[PDB]
Design a protein around this nucleic acid. Structure first.
Lengths: 686, 82, 85, 205
RNA sequence: AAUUGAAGAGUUUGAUCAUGGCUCAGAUUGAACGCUGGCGGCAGGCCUAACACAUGCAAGUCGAACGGUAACAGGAAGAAGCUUGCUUCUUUGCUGACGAGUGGCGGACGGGUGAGUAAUGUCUGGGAAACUGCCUGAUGGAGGGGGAUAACUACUGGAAACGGUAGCUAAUACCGCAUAACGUCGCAAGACCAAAGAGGGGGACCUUCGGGCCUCUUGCCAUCGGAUGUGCCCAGAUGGGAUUAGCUAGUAGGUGGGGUAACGGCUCACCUAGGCGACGAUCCCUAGCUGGUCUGAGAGGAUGACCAGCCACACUGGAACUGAGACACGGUCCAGACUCCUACGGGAGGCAGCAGUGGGGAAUAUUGCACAAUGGGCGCAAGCCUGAUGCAGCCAUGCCGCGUGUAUGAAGAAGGCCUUCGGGUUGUAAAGUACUUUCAGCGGGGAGGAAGGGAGUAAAGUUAAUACCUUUGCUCAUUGACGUUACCCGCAGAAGAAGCACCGGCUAACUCCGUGCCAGCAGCCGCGGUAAUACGGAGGGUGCAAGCGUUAAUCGGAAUUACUGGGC
């Protein structure tokens, strides 16, 4: 019942709104008496439905034929989930790239493709919209060639066009099928190739036999004579060529109209690779100096798995999904977590099915499931129960550029918000949690609106947390622009049943720039005991403490050099306490006296935006009151460099993704602090 | 029914079976009829280690009380008359 | 509830219908006894008694009405057929 | 569960040698005994009854190097047993294994005699003991193992052993380096400057 | 020899005595919190919401009860995988066993909880009207027949769970008949009631070669007892409030019928008109009781975690069945609340069982290993089941031990603090120089929990038998969760390991600087408005030590509800 060669871990990947969900739901229907069950049967729902792995069966014949189990990997809770696609590729063997036949430019559809090549994972294309208007198989095969350079080979040709789409022709076996129904697909019949299409069928057929003879002199000789290289080999030749990332078999149909889907499943079996058709996963031994070794998928060899997803369960609890690459993981055994250093107790194994849970005794190599128990195991960690020194891997890092302040309306929400982050950080280790330096709030950073949009929903509900879901907030820095003309510091009070006295004069001037944090600088010009040295330290602390709060908005004072030139001591006082205070008032007076001004952080921005949305990103930056430095050309795109107030960056993240469908991306780094804009300088005081 | 059992009133790692005639139904270290001797597995090799009163056992054994495995073993281990 | 011994339910229920019927036919006979005594029929009193005595002791020996209860009726009834007869 | 801190600092506080530095020199001196409890050693220790009542039991502790948590038990133990609670309390303390190594000469000093106990460098009626809370009983034969025998400290320890008062309730040797706890020390032996009725009151109130 | 042992102080006032409160010194606790934290042993570990619950598991077992072929493990006439000796199932139930099913038994025992209940309870001491599976003593029956059903076969409603007709077949399943005392009804006479057979082995002989028969063992049925368990009766004892004083009409009693294992208003009809109540009914509030536990000199006070007995409960309420025993904890039916499954017609489920989750709270943990041990259920036994239990993981919660070095070491370093500038103090502490290695780390050796079983033998008991079986010896090969066990030995280096409170008096321990009724300290008295031992820091010292403080709690102090042992 558990054949490694008949396993098919897949993942539906395509541009957003291209048809990933629809195609997945249909594959679950055809593959899934549970059939008539669901037949006769929005964010929360869209989230619940999708489950880790959804198994099912498909075999041309119940007996005397080859049956196959198709594990449809998904969950990617986000558009063209690069983070969920990447990890799913490493954890797997194959994928299916769905293209929007009507979708003209389908620019971000390139994002999901880059991930495929990123993890060198074989894939098959599927033009999902043949029924729709503008539904053009050719347009999909031409753009895939020019823009994606994926070297597509035509396997299927559409019968009829748009509305008149009634059938599909299998070009490999030279035979077609007709669908008597426009829905529910309850009528399919093996029909011969019609007339007005026979000629076109023979052309591509010899075009297909031509492609399956390239990388081989033997195949070459037969191609010349026209001799058909054995079929079992034409499927094996195309299979060998698709597994070695040299060609991409293309299929067609309409997931919605229920057409060509079944032929698509056959393609998955006939061409898509299994856990064995992919190079042994690599790793590093813990000897410091590398020693990389390949992990052959042998069930009897020493086990080695990779946890790729921690998941809180309203029932069983913490669940750590894994991908057994070697050996076997048994229930009731002890495994060694080498990334850390301790034995973990494995309580039970469990596979996630479409509707129910199944308790099993074991999970051999090449298989996947959930593991209850394991308290200290996180994502990325590697486990090895046979003692085979574990190894590790990680060759990337996710970006943010988006942070959201979150003042839980109460302390009760502050605590459950910390759990909503630390518990969801194990799953999505891309974001980061902090505390605003000049505020004291919770800041969550991500990749997009919907990302934090659903995260917020997961907080207020799942963790019950009503809060003033923040948007932009403010900060600021301050400094003077001109030299002080005098400013003294007199502190004389009979507060203490004893007199208190302190007298200091100081020349504080705006300070020069510098790489180091030395924005502050003190100098003692006291020439002749005017001020006793026993209290110079006092005045230094008095000043220091006051810099912590400015007059404009009570924020730390920086970039200033303070000098002391004159003072004196008196009849009873003269104490570290006396002159400490004597320094406080002197600073407050000076800062307010030397023309105060705000200092906002300026960021260095690099915007990649197609080659076509380039001019659009420039204009947008110019309007954001930024200052263009110059644009760099990268590939068929452009990188725009410029300075723009983190202040005024306000929403560029999304405004930029809006004019690019996400085509564009950007990175933001701190550069320097500059003097604010008059208009903003007035709004700060309060 | 009634049966002679060993009350595990010892300690962790170092137990001490306290034989006693009690009703099989009742818990092991629970309610009992009457105490009759004892048993110590970690009595080492010195002197006393298993002082079992037989004059009281044979009383219930023939009265209607059954015998356990380990108990019957102790009865056949410490001989009978010598 | 899925717990193997689920059979103990249908097993005890199957016996319920059994004991219910047997313990039922036992009453009628006992009924036709006090009835004859209630009216005053001396003859029918004993006649109906020699008909219950066998079944009363029978069911009593079975298990659905052991001892006492069995000797209860007979003892009382026998002390009722000799009051004014 | 030890002191580790300056030993003499304690003896100079009680105004009497606690045999903490009985290694070689005697009668203390050459240190700063007596007039040097602290910065105000000149200050005349004028305390009430409570003080002198505590300065007694606290002094006994510094000697055998015992702590309250453990000392408290000895009191409740000496009070449980039959006889003069004061005398009993001294018995248990005088029965300590580490103690049954000092008066024998196996250790130049109590702290040292106990140092050998921990490192299981001594045995009893056969088995080896490593703890100091070993309430040694009569007829026992405490000694040192064949390993690490007649080493360093043991030599010097047995050196000034005869120059000392030397008990009489035990049988110490030199060749085999063995010992035998004949009987428990009575109130007569070992005393002089030490009270019991005082160390009891403090734990009686 | 065996409950032989009792302490005080601070504060009213200018001062004193007396009276009378508060507070501290002593122990203790399922603690929590704050700081810190090295190891081992043992023990304990949801006190609030009996608040709601995912999943796994917690009660299965017997073929030596039976009908039987479905799975996989052997044999099998005869057929075949065929590469003509290498060898596969068509089936067959011949049998080692076994899904489902029928039947027997345990599911009423263990385990969990403090909800209720102030009296159908508990504790203590007795009583008499009964029942009592398994385990046992004694004495007899164990004869002879019949009618069905599950499984399964055919058909069929189903999504699943789970059924609907027609068939047919066996038994330690069920029901008659015969038999009938020391039994039951009864003064007596008489009358009346039970059963089940199934296995091991076997010599002349023999049959419808499966057996009859002989014999043995294990069960069935009846009666009288032992033992155990249970129900019931009765007296005493078992919290607070009077700002609750009358309460009760099945309530008290008689009789008759009925009723349960048994007595009884347990119930009903009738007659009687009493019954409970200052020695505290009723009502309200609160709470399980006890052995004991904590404290105390005792007397008492407080308390009822863990261990053990008892009662009651098992989401709430109610009722009933099966059975020796439950008005049942993983059983059932109905109602209420709630959750889950569903193709929408229709069903299922309850952790105050183990771990665990949501939620609450100051706070209480792993969804572990094994039936090796003990014990329980079934069985002849072998075995099987077993979240009881035996252990492990987590936490210093607590108790009890241990280590974090041991000696030597000077006119007494430097530095820091104080200083009448002489000096003192930190200070044998550090450095330096010898020596040692428990615990942690590493590498090896290696107790006990193991007694019994399983096959060969020598008898001894039964028998027609040396075969079978039971028991007792002998002999040989073997059955460990813990565990890298406990323990022991070897290697290296002192190498990896100390913080915490307090220092005015109470109460062991004080100088300086900083602060100046400000900032702050505080259990009580009482400190700070210029030399503050009380505030903050530092020096030093003291009290403790993997614990140390704080707070909370009961008792003692408290003769401060004073019976022992006080006043107006």
């Amino acid at each position: 019942t558990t054949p490694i060669a008949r396993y098919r871990n897949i993942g539906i990947s395509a541009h957003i709104d291209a048809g990933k969900t629809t195609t997945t739901e249909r594959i679950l229907f055809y593959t899934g008496g549970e059939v008539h069950d669901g037949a006769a049967t929005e964010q929360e729902r869209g989230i619940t439905i999708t489950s880790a792995a959804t198994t099912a069966f498909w075999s041309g014949m119940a007996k005397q034929y080859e049956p196959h189990r198709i594990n449809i990997i998904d969950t990617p809770g986000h558009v063209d989930f690069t983070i969920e696609v990447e990890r799913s590729m490493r954890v797997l063997d194959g994928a299916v790239m769905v293209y929007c036949a009507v979708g003209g430019v389908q620019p971000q559809s390139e994002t999901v493709w880059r991930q495929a090549n990123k993890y060198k994972v074989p894939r098959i294309a599927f033009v999902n919209k043949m029924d729709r208007m503008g539904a053009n198989f050719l347009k999909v095969v031409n753009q895939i060639k020019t823009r994606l350079g994926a070297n597509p080979v035509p396997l299927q040709l559409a019968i009829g066009a748009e509305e008149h789409f009634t059938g599909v022709v299998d070009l490999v076996k030279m035979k077609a099928i007709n669908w008597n129904d426009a829905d529910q697909g309850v009528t399919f019949e093996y029909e011969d190739i019609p007339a007005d299409m026979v000629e076109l069928a023979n052309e591509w057929h010899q075009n297909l036999i031509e492609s399956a003879a390239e990388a081989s002199e033997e195949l070459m000789e037969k191609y010349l004579g026209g001799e058909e290289l054995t079929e079992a080999e034409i499927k094996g030749a195309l299979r060998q060529r698709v597994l070695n990332n040299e060609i991409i078999l293309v299929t067609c149909g309409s997931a919605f109209k229920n057409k060509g889907v079944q032929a698509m499943l056959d393609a998955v079996i006939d061409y898509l690779p299994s856990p064995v058709d992919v190079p042994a996963i690599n790793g590093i031994l813990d000897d410091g100096k590398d020693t990389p070794a390949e992990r052959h998928a042998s069930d009897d060899e020493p086990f080695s798995a990779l946890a790729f997803k921690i998941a809180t369960d309203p029932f069983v609890g913490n669940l750590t999904f894994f991908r057994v690459y070697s050996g076997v993981v048994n229930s009731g055994d002890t495994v060694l977590n080498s990334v850390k250093a301790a034995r973990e107790r494995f309580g039970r194994i469990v596979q996630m099915h479409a509707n129910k849970r199944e308790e099993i005794k074991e999970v051999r190599a090449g298989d996947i499931a959930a593991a209850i128990g394991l308290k200290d195991v996180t994502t990325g960690d590697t486990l090895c129960d046979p003692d085979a020194p574990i190894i590790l891997e990680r060759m990337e890092f996710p970006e943010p550029v988006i942070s959201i302040a979150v003042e839980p309306k109460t302390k009760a929400d502050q605590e459950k918000m910390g759990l909503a982050l630390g518990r969801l950080a194990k799953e999505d280790p891309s974001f980061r949690v902090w505390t605003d330096e000049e505020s004291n709030q919770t800041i969550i950073a991500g990749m997009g609106e919907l990302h934090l949009d659903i995260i917020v929903d997961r907080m207020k509900r799942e963790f019950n947390v009503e809060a003033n879901v923040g948007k932009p907030q403010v900060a600021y820095r301050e400094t003077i622009r001109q030299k002080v003309t005098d400013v003294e510091g007199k502190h004389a009070k009979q507060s203490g049943g004893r007199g208190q006295y302190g007298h200091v004069v100081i020349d504080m001037y705006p300070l020069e720039p510098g790489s180091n944090p030395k924005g502050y600088e003190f100098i003692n010009d006291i020439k002749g005991g005017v001020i006793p040295g026993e209290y110079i330290p006092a005045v230094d602390k008095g000043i220091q403490e006051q810099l912590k709060a400015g007059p404009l908005a009570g924020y730390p004072v920086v970039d200033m050099g303070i000098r002391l030139h004159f003072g004196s001591y008196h009849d009873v006082d003269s104490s570290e306490l006396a002159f400490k205070l004597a320094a406080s008032i002197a600073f407050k007076e000076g800062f307010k006296k030397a023309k105060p001004v705000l200092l906002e952080p300026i960021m260095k921005v690099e915007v990649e935006t197609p080659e076509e949305n380039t001019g659009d990103v420039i204009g947008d930056l110019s309007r954001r009151r930024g200052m263009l430095k110059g644009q760099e050309s990268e590939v068929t795109g452009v990188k725009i460099h410029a300075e723009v107030p983190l202040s005024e960056m306000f929403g560029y993240a999304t405004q930029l993704r809006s004019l690019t469908k996400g085509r564009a991306s950007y990175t933001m780094e701190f550069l320097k602090y500059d003097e604010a804009p008059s208009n903003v300088a007035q709004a700060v005081i309060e | 029914m009634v049966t002679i059992r060993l009350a595990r009133h010892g300690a962790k790692k170092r137990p001490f079976y306290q034989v006693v005639v009690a009703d099989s139904r009742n818990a092991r270290n629970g309610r009992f009829i009457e105490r009759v001797g004892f048993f110590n597995p970690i009595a080492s090799e010195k002197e006393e280690g298993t002082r079992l009163d037989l004059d009281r056992i044979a009383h219930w054994v023939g009265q209607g009380a059954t015998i356990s495995d380990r108990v019957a073993a102790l009865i056949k281990e410490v001989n009978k008359a010598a | 509830n899925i717990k193997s011994a689920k059979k103990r339910a249908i097993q005890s229920e199957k016996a319920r219908k059994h004991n219910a019927s047997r313990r039922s036919m036992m009453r009628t006979f006992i009924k036709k006894v006090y009835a004859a005594i209630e009216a005053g029929d001396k003859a029918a009193a004993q006649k109906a008694f020699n008909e219950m005595q066998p079944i009363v002791d029978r069911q009593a020996a079975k298990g659905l009405i052991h001892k006492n209860k069995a000797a209860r009726h007979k003892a009382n009834l026998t002390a009722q057929i000799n009051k004014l007869a | 569960a030890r002191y580790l801190g300056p030993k003499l600092k304690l003896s100079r506080r009680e105004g009497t040698d606690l045999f903490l530095k009985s290694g070689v020199r005697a009668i203390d001196t050459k240190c700063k005994i007596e007039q040097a409890p602290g910065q105000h050693g000149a200050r005349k220790p004028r305390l009430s009854d409570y003080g002198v009542q505590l300065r007694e039991k606290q002094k006994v502790r510094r000697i055998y190097g015992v702590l309250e948590r453990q000392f408290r038990n000895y009191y409740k133990e000496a009070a449980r047993l039959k006889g003069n609670t004061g005398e009993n309390l001294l018995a248990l303390l005088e029965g300590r294994l580490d103690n049954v190594v000092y008066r024998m000469g196996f250790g130049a000093t109590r702290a040292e005699a106990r140092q050998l106990v921990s490192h299981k460098a001594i045995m009893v009626n056969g088995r080896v003991v490593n703890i100091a809370s070993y309430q040694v009983s009569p007829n026992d034969v405490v000694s040192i193992r064949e390993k690490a025998k007649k080493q360093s400290r043991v030599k010097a320890a047995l050196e000034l052993a005869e120059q000392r008062e030397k008990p009489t309730w035990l049988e110490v040797d030199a060749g085999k380096m063995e010992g035998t706890f004949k009987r428990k020390p009575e109130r007569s032996d070992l005393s002089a400057d030490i009270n019991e009725h005082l160390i009891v009151e403090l734990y009686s109130k």
